[PDB]
Symmetry: C2
Subunit: 147 residues, 2 copies
Amino acid sequence: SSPGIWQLDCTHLEGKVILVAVHVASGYIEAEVIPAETGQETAYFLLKLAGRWPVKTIHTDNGSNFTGATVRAACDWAGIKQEDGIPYVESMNKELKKIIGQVRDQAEHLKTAVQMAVFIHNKKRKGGIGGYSAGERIVDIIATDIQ
Amino acid sequence: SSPGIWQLDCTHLEGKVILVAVHVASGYIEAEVIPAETGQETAYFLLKLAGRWPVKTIHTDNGSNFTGATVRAACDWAGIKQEDGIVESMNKELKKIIGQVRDQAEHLKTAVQMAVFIHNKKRKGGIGGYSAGERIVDIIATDIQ
Ligand SMILES: [Cl-]
Ligand SMILES: [Cl-]
């Protein structure tokens, strides 16, 4: 259920393609620059995500890199179901882009900045006492679901 | 035991370099093929790991890709401390699983992720048993408080 639901969208910066996976219930993110927006590279990214978190369902934009039997085969193999797409990334790709822009000049290559931004986003809280970061929220949700 | 303790080791296959990070207490793995065993690529891999899990300390082989200011600056920036350093049972397995699925993948990188998936989803001892994936989350969940 909610524990295994992720949204996958693409973002573009400096002629590069970035795939962003958001764990809906927590706001937690996994993002990476990929060589091209193809089924082969999208399948690779999804297989990487699935081996790190319990991915059960994904909501994508259902674009071209999903019509090929590549991504379909990967989702099949990993036990991932593809459902309804994203509406029309909302305040995520922009937010992630915001952090990236803020730290872009601190890294030589874009890939490093992307990861610095993912780190900042997932460790971000919302006040003292509790607050809870997206990183803590995802772990709590999955923990209190597998037990 | 080890809330944010990870071991980072390198492995080589088909003329390529793979970085393997093992969460000591759970056995959970994060591994990827990197373009070269350099400080710049090692720092990249560590930053990626650090943004996905609460990494506090890493045990590495303290080799050449750790003498450069690159990895030191990355650990510093992420708040990671480098300690003693080199499990072996989790690593060796990775190569075996990779060998069992290499044929299904066009590129090695894909086979590696397939292997990571299989390893982290592996059930402890059938029924009631726990996978490394479930163990790492349960460990960090109880640590948050
Ligand atoms: Cl996409
Ligand atoms: Cl290494």
